[PDB]
Design a protein around this ligand. Structure first.
Ligand SMILES: CCCCCCCC/C=C\CCCCCCCC(=O)OC[C@H](COP(=O)(O)OCC[N+](C)(C)C)OC(=O)CCCCCCC/C=C\CCCCCCCC
Ligand SMILES: *[C@@H]1O[C@H](CO[C@@H]2O[C@@H](C)[C@@H](O)[C@@H](O)[C@@H]2O)[C@@H](O[C@@H]2O[C@H](CO)[C@@H](O[C@H]3O[C@H](CO)[C@@H](O)[C@H](O)[C@@H]3O)[C@H](O)[C@H]2NC(C)=O)[C@H](O)[C@H]1NC(C)=O
Ligand SMILES: CCCCCCCC/C=C\CCCCCCCC(=O)O[C@H]1CC[C@@]2(C)C(=CC[C@H]3[C@@H]4CC[C@H]([C@H](C)CCCC(C)C)[C@@]4(C)CC[C@@H]32)C1
Ligand SMILES: CCCCCCCC/C=C\CCCCCCCC(=O)O[C@H]1CC[C@@]2(C)C(=CC[C@H]3[C@@H]4CC[C@H]([C@H](C)CCCC(C)C)[C@@]4(C)CC[C@@H]32)C1
Ligand SMILES: CCc1cc(Oc2ccnc(N(Cc3cccc(OC(F)(F)C(F)F)c3)C[C@@H](O)C(F)(F)F)n2)ccc1Cl
Ligand SMILES: [Cl-]
Length: 472
């Protein structure tokens, strides 16, 4: 099978196992969110006659999941199985002897309902107009115990029977209702939030990605996989253009998380980034001086002399894209074909002696990426400079100068820009909380037409309890 998608996410069974360690905490939340209504009636009891009962203010007093387990069910769902969840409820029982008026005042006894349940939640994933939706119509409960204990172990002779032969069943059924409802909601809340926070990651200012699902996620026995458009939005405008073709053989099932990106996604990025005016750099005096020193050079060398020349504080440089850069995915790495304009201005006393060179050129660079120590690492694999129109703007012009400047673009130019990019990208990752998850041995792979992100993750046992508290 093939899919039409710009971006594809694969979350494998190994990852779900790590996520299941937190299942208990989530099932807890559903129980705390449920609305247990008052159970009331007025039945005729053996010998006592009419009795006006009421089990009031049903609240959870204790919760404890024994063992939880996940299981991907081929072309269907996620079968989450919870065992021996010990739930203890608190309340006040209110009753009155109606027909036996001589039996004195009505009573209020505090009670504890002690249950133990087994749960099966079969969660089916669908694409609700680009958004990922959760559905668990198949939600099951198995009660081992459901004992009612009253304060002081009081019993006139009707409570226990009225509980077992009436309240037991109804309460059990109400409980399933409320639990499977609140699971279904919290399930959706996660999915919407996860998606929303993912678009928040993939977006900055007027630039944003379109993660609309290109169809219902795929469930197999080894993984769960979603397929998205990956169109870049600029200033709330998107072009719904023909989608690339994706093969689910290009992705494994060993790693926890797999990400597949068409080169068309990097191309939309170049389009938007370029058009937003993001693709430019300007350096002045002290900063320009620092940049050369950063790339290991002493500004007071015989070479750096006739250039700056005497007044380096006023020496300026500007690099900008003349056209949208051509980003391509190859096996050898990421290749960026960019057409730049490097303008050099070195002022002297008189504007006649001031050195001003404008290098109009195409710089092709094969870049390779890495993630280590919560930083993005870009490394130059191969490059090529093809000058187009190298113009001089004063009489202070020579081929030694022209070569010197051309080299500065090569030797310092490319490495500084490459650095600034890894700085700028890592910045965002942190600014969108990527630096919060334990990203275990990630691999950034490059292939002809696409790029892969293969990673295992350590889930932060705090990050859930954070979102989990932000509900009420
Ligand atoms: C298109 C990617 C660029 C790489 C190809 C171009 C190669 C270079 C071409 C020409 C060189 C001339 C330009 C030289 C300046 C660039 C270097 C730079 O100095 O800075 C990177 C700029 C930001 O310039 P600035 O004036 O705004 O910042 C100020 C920057 N300072 C703080 C460092 C001073 O580059 C950007 O903005 C672009 C990045 C904006 C993307 C963020 C938008 C949200 C979308 C996605 C999030 C991440 C997606 C990743 C996963 C999906 C795969 C695509
Ligand atoms: C850019 O620099 C030119 C000189 O630099 C040299 O040529 C570049 C093409 C490049 O190879 C660079 O590395 C070299 O150092 C400037 O051109 C010069 O301009 C002068 C004034 O027009 C000119 O002079 C005389 O020219 C004729 C012939 O000698 C006389 O008849 C006339 O009266 C002038 O006195 C000089 O010859 C000319 N050089 C060349 C090779 O043509 C160019 O103007 C400069 N650009 C700017 C905008 O300043
Ligand atoms: C690069 C970024 C690295 C971040 C690493 C990282 O932590 O990634 C995980 C983030 C959360 C998630 C997206 C994931 C994996 C599985 C996803 C989940 C599958 C089932 C979940 C449903 C809501 C059903 C829940 C049933 C339950 C009994 C309540 C769903 C879709 C929630 C989100 C996760 C990867
Ligand atoms: C004295 C000196 C001054 C002189 C004037 C200077 C002259 C300079 C002249 C020209 C400048 C042009 C030369 C520079 C060319 C730049 C080339 C250049 O660096 O292009 C690269 C830019 C970044 C990127 C798009 C790329 C490749 C890989 C991409 C990345 C792969 C994965 C990355 C994920 C976001 C993170 C996954 C890790 C996860 C957290 C686990 C992703 C998509 C980030 C972006 C890159 C190509
Ligand atoms: C930033 C991660 C990401 C999310 C994408 O869009 C969506 C939209 C909806 N669901 C998903 N899922 C994948 C996923 C995995 C890991 C993290 C993540 O987003 C997040 F970083 F925001 C999370 F940590 F909060 C999303 C989930 C989808 O596969 C599923 F399971 F619901 F079917 N991705 C598309 C690309 C990328 Cl790189
Ligand atoms: Cl009594």
């Amino acid at each position: 099978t093939s899919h039409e998608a710009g971006i594809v996410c694969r979350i494998t069974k190994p990852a779900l196992l790590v996520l299941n360690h937190e299942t208990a905490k989530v099932i807890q939340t559903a129980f705390q969110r449920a609305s247990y209504p008052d159970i009331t009636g007025e039945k005729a009891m053996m010998l006592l006659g009419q009795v006006k009962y009421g089990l009031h203010n049903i609240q959870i007093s204790h919760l404890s999941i024994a063992s939880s387990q996940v299981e991907l069910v081929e072309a269907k769902s996620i079968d989450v199985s919870i065992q021996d969840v010990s739930v203890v409820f608190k309340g006040t029982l209110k009753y009155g002897y109606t027909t036996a008026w001589w039996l004195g005042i009505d009573q209020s006894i505090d009670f504890e309902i002690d249950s133990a349940i087994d749960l099966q939640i079969n969660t089916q994933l669908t694409a609700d107009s680009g958004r990922v939706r959760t559905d668990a119509p198949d939600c099951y409960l198995s009660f081992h115990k459901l004992l009612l204990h009253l304060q002081g172990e009081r019993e006139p002779g009707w409570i226990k029977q009225l509980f077992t032969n009436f309240i037991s069943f109804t309460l059990k059924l109400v409980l399933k209702g409320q639990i499977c409802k609140e699971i279904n909601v919290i399930s959706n809340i996660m999915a919407d939030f996860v998606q929303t926070r993912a678009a928040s990651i993939l977006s900055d200012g007027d630039i944003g990605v379109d993660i609309s699902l290109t169809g219902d996620p795929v469930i197999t026995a080894s993984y769960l996989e979603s397929h998205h458009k990956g169109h870049f939005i600029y200033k709330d405008v998107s072009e719904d253009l023909p989608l690339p073709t994706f093969s689910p053989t290009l992705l494994g099932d060993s790693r926890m998380l797999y990400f597949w990106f068409s080169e068309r996604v990097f191309h939309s990025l170049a389009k938007v980034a370029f058009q937003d005016g993001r693709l430019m750099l300007s350096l002045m005096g002290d900063e320009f001086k620092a940049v050369l020193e950063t790339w290991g050079f002493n500004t007071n060398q015989e070479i750096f002399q006739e250039v700056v020349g005497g007044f380096p504080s006023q020496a300026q440089v500007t690099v900008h894209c003349l056209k949208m850069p051509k980003i391509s995915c190859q096996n050898k790495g990421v290749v960026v074909d960019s057409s730049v304009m490097v303008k050099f201005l070195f002022p002297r006393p008189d504007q006649q002696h001031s050195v001003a060179y404008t290098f109009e050129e195409d710089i092709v660079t094969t870049v390779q990426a890495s993630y280590s120590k919560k930083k993005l690492f870009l490394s130059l694999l191969d490059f090529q400079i093809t000058p187009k129109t190298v113009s001089n703007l004063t009489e202070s012009s020579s081929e030694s100068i022209q070569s010197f400047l051309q080299s500065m673009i090569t030797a310092v130019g490319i490495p500084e820009v490459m650095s600034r990019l890894e700085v700028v990208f890592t910045a965002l990752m942190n600014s969108k909380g990527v630096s919060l998850f334990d990203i275990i041995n990630p691999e950034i792979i490059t292939r002809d037409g696409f790029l892969l992100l293969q990673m295992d993750f350590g889930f932060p046992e705090h990050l859930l309890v954070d979102f989990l508290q932000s509900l009420s």
